[PDB]
Coordinates of C-alpha atoms and ligand atoms in Angstrom, one line a residue:
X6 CA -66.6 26.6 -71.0
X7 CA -65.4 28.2 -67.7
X8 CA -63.1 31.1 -67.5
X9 CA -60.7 32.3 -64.9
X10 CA -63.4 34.4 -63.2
X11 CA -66.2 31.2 -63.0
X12 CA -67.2 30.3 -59.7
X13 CA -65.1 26.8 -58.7
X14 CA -68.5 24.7 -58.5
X15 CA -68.7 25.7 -62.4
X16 CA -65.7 24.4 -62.8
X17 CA -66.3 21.0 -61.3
X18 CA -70.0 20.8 -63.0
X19 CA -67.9 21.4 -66.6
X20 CA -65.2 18.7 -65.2
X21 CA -67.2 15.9 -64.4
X22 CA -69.7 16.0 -67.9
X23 CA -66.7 14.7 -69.8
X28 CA -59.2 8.7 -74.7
X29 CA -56.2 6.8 -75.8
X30 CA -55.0 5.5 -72.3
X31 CA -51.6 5.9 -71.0
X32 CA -49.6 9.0 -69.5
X33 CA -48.9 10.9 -72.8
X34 CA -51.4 13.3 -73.5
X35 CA -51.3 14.1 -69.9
X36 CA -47.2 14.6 -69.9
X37 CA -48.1 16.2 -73.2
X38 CA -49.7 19.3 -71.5
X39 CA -47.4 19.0 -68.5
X40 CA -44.6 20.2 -70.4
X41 CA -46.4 23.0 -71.9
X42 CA -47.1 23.9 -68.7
X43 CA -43.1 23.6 -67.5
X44 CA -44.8 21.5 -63.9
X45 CA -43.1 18.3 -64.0
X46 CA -41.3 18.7 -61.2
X47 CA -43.3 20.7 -58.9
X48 CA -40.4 21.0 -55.9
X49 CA -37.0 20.4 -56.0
X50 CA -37.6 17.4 -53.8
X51 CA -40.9 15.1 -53.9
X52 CA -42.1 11.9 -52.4
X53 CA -44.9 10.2 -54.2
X54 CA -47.0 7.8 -52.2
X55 CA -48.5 4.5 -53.4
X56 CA -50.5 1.4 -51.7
X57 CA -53.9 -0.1 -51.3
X58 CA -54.5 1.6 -47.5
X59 CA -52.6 4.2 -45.4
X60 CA -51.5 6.8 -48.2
X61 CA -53.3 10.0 -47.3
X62 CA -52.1 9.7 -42.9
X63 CA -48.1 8.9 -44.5
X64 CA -48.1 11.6 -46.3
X65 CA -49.8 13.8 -43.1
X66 CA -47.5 12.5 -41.3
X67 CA -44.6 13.6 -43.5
X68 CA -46.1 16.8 -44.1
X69 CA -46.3 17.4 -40.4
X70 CA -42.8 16.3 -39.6
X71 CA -41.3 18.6 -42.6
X72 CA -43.1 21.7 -41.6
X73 CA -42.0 21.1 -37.7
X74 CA -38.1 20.6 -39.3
X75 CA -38.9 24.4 -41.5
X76 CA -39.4 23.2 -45.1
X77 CA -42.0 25.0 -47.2
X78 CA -44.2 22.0 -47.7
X79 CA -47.1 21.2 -50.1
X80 CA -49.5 18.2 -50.6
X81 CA -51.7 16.5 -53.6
X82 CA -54.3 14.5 -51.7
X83 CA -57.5 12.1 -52.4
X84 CA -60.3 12.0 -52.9
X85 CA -61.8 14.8 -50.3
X86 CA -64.3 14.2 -47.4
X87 CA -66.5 17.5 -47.8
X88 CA -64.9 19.9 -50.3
X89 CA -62.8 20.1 -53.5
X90 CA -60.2 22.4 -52.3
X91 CA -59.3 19.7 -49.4
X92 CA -56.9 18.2 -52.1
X93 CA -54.4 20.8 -52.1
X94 CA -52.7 22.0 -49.2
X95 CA -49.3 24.4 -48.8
X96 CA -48.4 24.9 -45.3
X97 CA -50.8 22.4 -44.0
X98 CA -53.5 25.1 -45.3
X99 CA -55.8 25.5 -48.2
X100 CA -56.2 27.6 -51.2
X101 CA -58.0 30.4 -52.0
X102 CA -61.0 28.7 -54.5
X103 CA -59.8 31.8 -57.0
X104 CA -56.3 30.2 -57.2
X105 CA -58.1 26.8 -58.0
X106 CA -60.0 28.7 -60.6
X107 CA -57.3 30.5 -62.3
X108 CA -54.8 27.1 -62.6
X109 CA -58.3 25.6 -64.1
X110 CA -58.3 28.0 -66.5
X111 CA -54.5 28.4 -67.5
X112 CA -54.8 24.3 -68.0
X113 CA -57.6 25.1 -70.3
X114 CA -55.9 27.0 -72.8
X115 CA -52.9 24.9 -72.4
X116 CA -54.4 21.8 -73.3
X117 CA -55.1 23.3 -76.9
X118 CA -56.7 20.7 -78.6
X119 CA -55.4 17.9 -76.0
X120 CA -58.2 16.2 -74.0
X121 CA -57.6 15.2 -70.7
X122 CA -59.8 13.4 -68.2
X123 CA -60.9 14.9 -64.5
X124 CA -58.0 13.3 -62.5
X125 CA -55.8 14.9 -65.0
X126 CA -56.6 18.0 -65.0
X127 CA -56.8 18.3 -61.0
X128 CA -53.3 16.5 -61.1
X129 CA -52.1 19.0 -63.3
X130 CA -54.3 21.9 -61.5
X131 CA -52.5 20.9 -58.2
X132 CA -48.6 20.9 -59.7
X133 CA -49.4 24.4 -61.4
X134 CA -50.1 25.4 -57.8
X135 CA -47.4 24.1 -56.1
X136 CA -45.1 25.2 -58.8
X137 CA -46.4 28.9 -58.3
X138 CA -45.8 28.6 -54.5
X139 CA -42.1 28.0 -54.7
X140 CA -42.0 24.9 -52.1
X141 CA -39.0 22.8 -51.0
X142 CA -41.0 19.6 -51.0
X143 CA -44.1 18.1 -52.7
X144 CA -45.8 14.8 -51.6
X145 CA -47.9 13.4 -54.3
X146 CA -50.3 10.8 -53.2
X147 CA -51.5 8.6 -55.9
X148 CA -54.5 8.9 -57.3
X149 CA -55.0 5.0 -58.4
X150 CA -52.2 2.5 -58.4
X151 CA -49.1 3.7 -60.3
X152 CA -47.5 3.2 -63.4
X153 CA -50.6 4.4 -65.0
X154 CA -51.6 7.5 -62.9
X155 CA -51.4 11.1 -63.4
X156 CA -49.1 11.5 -60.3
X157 CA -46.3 8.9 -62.4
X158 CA -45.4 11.8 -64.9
X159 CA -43.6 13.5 -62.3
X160 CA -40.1 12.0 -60.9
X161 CA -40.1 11.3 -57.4
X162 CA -36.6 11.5 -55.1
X163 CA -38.2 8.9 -52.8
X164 CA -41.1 6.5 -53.9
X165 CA -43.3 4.8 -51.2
X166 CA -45.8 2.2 -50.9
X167 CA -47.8 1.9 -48.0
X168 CA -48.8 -1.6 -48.0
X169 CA -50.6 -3.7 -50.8
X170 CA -54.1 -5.5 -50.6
X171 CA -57.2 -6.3 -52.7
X172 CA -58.5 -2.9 -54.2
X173 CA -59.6 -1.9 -57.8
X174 CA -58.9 -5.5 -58.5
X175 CA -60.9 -4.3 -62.1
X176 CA -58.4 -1.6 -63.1
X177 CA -54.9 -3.5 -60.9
X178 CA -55.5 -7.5 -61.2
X179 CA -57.2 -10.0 -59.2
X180 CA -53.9 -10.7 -57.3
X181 CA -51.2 -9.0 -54.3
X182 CA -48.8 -9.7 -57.0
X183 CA -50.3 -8.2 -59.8
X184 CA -51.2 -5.1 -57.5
X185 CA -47.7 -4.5 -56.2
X186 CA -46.2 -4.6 -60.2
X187 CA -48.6 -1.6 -61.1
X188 CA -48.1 0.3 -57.3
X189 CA -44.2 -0.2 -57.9
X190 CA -44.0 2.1 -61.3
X191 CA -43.8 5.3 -59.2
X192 CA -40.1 3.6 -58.9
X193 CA -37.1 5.6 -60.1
X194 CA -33.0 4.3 -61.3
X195 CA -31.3 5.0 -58.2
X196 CA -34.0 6.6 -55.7
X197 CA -34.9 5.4 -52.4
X198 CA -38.2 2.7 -53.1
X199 CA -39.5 2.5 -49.6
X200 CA -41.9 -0.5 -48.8
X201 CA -43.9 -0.2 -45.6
X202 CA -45.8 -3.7 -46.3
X203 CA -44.5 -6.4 -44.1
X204 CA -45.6 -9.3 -47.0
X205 CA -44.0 -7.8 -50.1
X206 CA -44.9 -9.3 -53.3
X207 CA -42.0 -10.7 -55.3
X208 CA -43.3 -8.8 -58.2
X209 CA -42.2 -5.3 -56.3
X210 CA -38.3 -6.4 -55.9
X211 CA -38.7 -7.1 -59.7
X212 CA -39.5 -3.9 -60.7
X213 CA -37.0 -2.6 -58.4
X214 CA -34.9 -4.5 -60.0
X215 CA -36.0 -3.4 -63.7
X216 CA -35.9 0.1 -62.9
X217 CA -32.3 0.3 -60.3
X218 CA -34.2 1.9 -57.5
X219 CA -32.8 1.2 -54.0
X220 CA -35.3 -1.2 -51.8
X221 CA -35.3 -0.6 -48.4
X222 CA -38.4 -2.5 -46.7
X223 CA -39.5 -3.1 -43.4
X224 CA -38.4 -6.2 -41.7
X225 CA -35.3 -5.8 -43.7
X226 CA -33.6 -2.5 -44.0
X227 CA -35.8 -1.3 -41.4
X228 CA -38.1 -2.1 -38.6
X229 CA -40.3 -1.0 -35.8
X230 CA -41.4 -2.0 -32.2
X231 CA -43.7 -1.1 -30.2
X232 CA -44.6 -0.6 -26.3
X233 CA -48.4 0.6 -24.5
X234 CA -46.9 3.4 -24.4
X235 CA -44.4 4.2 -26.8
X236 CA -42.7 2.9 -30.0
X237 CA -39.0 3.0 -31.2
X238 CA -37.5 2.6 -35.4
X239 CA -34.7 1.3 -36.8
X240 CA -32.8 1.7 -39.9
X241 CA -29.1 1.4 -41.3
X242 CA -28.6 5.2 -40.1
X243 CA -29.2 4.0 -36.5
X244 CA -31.9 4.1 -34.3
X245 CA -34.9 6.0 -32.6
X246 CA -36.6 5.8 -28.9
X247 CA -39.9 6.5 -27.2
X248 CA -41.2 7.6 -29.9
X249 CA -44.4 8.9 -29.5
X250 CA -47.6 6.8 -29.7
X251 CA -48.9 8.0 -32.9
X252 CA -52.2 9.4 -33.7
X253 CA -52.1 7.4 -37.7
X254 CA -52.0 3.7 -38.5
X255 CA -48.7 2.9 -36.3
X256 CA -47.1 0.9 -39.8
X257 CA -47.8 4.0 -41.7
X258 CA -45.8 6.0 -38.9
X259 CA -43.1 3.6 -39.2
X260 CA -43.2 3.9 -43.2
X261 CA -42.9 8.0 -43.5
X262 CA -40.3 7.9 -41.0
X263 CA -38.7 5.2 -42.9
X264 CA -39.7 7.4 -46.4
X265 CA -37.8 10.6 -44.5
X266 CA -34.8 9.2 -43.2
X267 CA -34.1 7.6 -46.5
X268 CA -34.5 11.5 -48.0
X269 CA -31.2 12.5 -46.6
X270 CA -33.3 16.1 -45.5
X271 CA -32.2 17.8 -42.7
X272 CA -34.6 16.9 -40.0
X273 CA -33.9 16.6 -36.5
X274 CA -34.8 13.8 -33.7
X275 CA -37.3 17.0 -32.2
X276 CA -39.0 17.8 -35.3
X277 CA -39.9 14.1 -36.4
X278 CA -41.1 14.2 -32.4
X279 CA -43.0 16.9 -33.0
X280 CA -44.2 15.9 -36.4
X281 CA -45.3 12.1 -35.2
X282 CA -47.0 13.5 -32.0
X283 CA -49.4 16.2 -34.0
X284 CA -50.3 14.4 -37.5
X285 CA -53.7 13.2 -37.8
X286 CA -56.5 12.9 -40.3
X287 CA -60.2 13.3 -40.1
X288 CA -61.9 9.9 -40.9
X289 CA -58.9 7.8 -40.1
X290 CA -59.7 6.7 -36.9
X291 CA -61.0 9.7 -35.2
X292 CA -61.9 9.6 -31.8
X293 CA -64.2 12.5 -32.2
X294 CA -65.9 11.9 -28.4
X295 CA -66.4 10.3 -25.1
X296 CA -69.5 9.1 -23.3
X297 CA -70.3 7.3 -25.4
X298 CA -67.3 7.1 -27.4
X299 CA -67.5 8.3 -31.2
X300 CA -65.4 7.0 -33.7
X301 CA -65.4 7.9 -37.7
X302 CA -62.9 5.6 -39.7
X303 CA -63.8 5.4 -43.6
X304 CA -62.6 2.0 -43.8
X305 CA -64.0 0.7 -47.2
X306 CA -62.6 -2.2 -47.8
X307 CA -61.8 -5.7 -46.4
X308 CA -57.8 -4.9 -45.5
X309 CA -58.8 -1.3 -43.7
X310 CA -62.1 -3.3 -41.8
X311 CA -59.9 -5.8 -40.8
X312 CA -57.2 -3.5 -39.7
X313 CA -60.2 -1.6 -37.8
X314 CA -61.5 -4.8 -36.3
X315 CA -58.0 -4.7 -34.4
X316 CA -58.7 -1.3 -33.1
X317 CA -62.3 -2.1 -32.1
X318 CA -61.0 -5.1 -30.2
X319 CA -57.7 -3.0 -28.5
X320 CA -60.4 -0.7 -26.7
X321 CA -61.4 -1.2 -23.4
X322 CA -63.6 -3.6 -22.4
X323 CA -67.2 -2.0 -22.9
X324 CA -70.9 -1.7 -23.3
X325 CA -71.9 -2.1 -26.7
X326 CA -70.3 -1.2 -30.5
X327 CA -73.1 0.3 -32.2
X328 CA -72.6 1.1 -36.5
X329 CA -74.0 3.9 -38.5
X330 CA -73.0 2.8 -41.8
X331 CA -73.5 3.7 -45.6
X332 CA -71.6 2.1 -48.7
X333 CA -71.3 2.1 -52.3
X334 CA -71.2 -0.7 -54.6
X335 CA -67.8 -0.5 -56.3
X336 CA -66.6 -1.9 -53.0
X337 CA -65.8 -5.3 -51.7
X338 CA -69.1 -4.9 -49.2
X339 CA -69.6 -8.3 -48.2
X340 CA -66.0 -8.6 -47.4
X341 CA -65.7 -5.7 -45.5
X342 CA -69.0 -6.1 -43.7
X343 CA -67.6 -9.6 -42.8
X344 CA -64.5 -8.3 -40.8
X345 CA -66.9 -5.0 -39.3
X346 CA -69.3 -8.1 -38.2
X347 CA -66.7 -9.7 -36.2
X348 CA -66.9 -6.5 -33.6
X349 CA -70.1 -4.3 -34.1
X350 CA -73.0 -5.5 -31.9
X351 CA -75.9 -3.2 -33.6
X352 CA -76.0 -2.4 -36.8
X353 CA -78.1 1.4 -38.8
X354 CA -78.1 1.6 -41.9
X355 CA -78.5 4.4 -44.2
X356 CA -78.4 4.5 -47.9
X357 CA -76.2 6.3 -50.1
X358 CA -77.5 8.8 -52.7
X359 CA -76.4 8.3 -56.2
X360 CA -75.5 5.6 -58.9
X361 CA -72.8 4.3 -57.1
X362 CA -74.3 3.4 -53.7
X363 CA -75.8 0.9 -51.9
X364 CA -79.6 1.3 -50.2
X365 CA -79.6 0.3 -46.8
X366 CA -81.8 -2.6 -47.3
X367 CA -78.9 -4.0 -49.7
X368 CA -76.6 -3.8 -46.5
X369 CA -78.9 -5.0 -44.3
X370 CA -79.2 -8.5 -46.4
X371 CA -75.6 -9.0 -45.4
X372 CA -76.0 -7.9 -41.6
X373 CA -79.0 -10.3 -41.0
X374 CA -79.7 -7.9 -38.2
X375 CA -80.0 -4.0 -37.8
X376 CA -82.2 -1.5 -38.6
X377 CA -82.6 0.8 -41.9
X378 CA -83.1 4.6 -41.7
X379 CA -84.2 7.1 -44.5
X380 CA -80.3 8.9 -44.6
X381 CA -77.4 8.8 -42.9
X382 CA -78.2 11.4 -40.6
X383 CA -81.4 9.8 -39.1
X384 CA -79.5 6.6 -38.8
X385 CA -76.7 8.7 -37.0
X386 CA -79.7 10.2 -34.9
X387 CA -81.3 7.2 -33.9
X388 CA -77.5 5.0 -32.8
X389 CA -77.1 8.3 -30.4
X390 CA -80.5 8.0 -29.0
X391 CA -79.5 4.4 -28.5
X392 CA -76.2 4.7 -27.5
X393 CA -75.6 4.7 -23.5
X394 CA -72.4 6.3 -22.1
X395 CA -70.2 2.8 -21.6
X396 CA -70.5 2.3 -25.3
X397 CA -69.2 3.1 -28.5
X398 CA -70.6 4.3 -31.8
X399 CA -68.8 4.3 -34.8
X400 CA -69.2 5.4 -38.4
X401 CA -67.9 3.9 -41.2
X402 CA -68.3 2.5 -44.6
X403 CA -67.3 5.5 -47.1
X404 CA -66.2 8.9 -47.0
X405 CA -69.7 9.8 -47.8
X406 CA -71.0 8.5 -44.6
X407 CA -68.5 9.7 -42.4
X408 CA -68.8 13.3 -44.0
X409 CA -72.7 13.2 -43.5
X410 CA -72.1 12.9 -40.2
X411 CA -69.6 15.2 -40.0
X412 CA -71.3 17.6 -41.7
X413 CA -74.5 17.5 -39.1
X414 CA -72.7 17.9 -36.1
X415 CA -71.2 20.7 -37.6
X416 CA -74.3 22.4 -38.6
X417 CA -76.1 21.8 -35.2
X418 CA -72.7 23.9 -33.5
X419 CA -75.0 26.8 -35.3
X420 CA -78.6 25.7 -33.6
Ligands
LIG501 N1 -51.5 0.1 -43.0 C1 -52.9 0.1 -43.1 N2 -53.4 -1.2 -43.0 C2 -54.7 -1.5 -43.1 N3 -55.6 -0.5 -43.2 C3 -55.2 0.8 -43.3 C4 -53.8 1.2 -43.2 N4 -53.8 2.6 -43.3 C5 -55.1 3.0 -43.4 N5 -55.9 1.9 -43.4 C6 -57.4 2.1 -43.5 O1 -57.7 2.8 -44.7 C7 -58.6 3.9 -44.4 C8 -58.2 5.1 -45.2 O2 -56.9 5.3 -45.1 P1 -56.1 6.5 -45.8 O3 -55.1 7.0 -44.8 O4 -57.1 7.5 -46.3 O5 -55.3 5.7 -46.8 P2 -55.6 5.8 -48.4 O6 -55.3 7.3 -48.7 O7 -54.7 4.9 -49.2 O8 -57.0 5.5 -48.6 C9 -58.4 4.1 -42.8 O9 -59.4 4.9 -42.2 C10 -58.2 2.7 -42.3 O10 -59.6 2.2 -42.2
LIG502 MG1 -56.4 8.8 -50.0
LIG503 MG1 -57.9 3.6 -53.5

């Protein structure tokens, strides 16, 4: 067993060698630990796609407006401590450490699983920092996760799709019943999906939180150049193009005006025009073009597809890309194979992932590589100045790559 003084990677090793479902010994060891409601205001953010840039772009727009801000994010591109920021900043790997440990002796006899104990790790250090506001994203679905023993002032849902189908249902409707338990009696629900599953007014209903979705309570349009919001408070113009999924713009502006938080038409300016996520379609280049997006499944390809296909008229779409199995491959290589003209692929190490012949059966053209590094080698050798080369599949493959170009900065 660690201690306080272990080194965070022996903290993680003990972690992952690890029943009774449900929220209660969790909530159990929350209220030992007094951290059930981290902030004095929190937003908790559910959906199938589009949680981690609405809850960037929250956090950005909060900071810009002055409020001491801290966010609960998943899972991480490169490294653990990625999933806990205050300030827009991360924590010191000691703090990490010493929540670890104080969750340890907590827990008495109590076992808890690994997204519990980060969940509870990460609202014992926003508690300690003293915020204003805490934005929970959700770890999987809803009623069920770690993140629902907390009580949000203003629940969200992103939008709803086909995901974890083996832990939420086969169906959008069985989905959105599970996604809609971070709902609350009397607190704004705010529903950024434009097709909402009956099954989400019901539990609105059940529970007597106030609905407001888009296309009803509120909506958005867009320009080329610009986009303007509207909502019972009133309305917003030339906003600024934003640098997230424009519906999950639409949905955190939605999610904050619904708050009732002091922010003003500048800040949310401000906030909008600077949020942005790494792996969420990142235009990290030009000549040729470079684009990571970690679009794993078929809603995100498809809502990539639509990207790919906005871009100027080009050379060619070259793909370095890497998967793992516990995705919906053949549907999201489907949608990717609507727009990518050469494929490389590169296996993924592990249990979990996919070998890049496996891929390649469902191409029926491209080329296999060793890693995703010699894959990402060999598209860039390839690649001529008109075109466009863009990583995808997981978060491992976009980190690889990531992680390479970093390294070379050094050579
Ligand atoms: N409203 C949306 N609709 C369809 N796909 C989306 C949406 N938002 C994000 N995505 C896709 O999901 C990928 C990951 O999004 P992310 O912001 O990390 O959301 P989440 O945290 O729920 O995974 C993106 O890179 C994009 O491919
Ligand atoms: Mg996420
Ligand atoms: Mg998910």
């Amino acid at each position: 067993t660690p201690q306080a003084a272990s080194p965070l990677a022996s903290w993680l090793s003990y972690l992952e060698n690890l029943i009774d479902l449900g929220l209660e010994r969790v909530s159990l060891v929350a209220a030992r630990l007094g951290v059930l409601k981290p902030a004095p205001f929190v937003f908790t953010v559910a959906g199938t796609n589009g949680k981690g840039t609405t809850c960037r772009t929250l956090e950005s727009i909060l900071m810009a407006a002055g409020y001491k801000v801290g966010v609960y994010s998943s899972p991480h591109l490169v490294r653990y401590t990625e999933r806990v920021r205050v300030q827009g900043q991360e924590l010191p790997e000691s703090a990490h450490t010493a929540s670890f440990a104080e969750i340890e002796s907590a827990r008495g006899d109590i076992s808890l699983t690994y997204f519990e104990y980060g969940t509870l790790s990460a609202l014992w250090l926003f508690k300690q920092a003293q915020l204003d506001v805490v934005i929970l994203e959700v770890g999987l679905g809803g009623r069920l996760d770690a993140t629902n023993i907390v009580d949000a002032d203003v629940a969200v849902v992103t939008s709803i799709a086909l995901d974890h189908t083996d832990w939420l249902g086969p169906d959008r409707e069985s989905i959105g019943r599970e996604k809609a338990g971070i709902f609350r009696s009397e607190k704004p629900a705010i529903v950024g999906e434009p097709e909402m599953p009956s099954t989400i007014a019901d539990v609105a209903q059940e529970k007597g939180a106030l609905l407001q979705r888009r296309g009803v309570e509120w909506n958005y349009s867009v320009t080329d150049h610009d986009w303007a919001f509207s909502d019972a408070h009133g309305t917003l113009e030339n906003l600024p193009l934003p640098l997230v999924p424009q519906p999950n713009a639409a949905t955190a502006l939605a999610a904050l005006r619904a708050s009732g938080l002091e922010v003003s038409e500048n800040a949310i300016r401000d906030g909008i025009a600077s949020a942005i996520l790494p792996g969420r379609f990142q235009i990290v280049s030009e000549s040729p073009r470079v684009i990571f997006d970690v679009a794993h499944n078929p809603h995100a390809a498809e809502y990539l597809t639509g990207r790919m296909k906005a871009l100027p008229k080009n050379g060619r779409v070259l793909a370095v890309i890497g998967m793992l199995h516990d995705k919906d491959i053949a549907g999201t290589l489907a949608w990717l194979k609507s727009v990518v003209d050469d494929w490389y692929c590169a296996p993924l190490e592990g249990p979990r992932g996919a070998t890049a012949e496996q891929l390649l059966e469902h191409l029926g053209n491209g080329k296999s590589f060793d890693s995703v590094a010699q894959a990402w080698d060999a598209a860039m050798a390839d690649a001529k100045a008109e075109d466009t080369v863009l990583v995808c599949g997981s978060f491992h493959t976009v980190a690889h790559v990531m992680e390479v170009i970093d390294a070379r900065r050094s050579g």
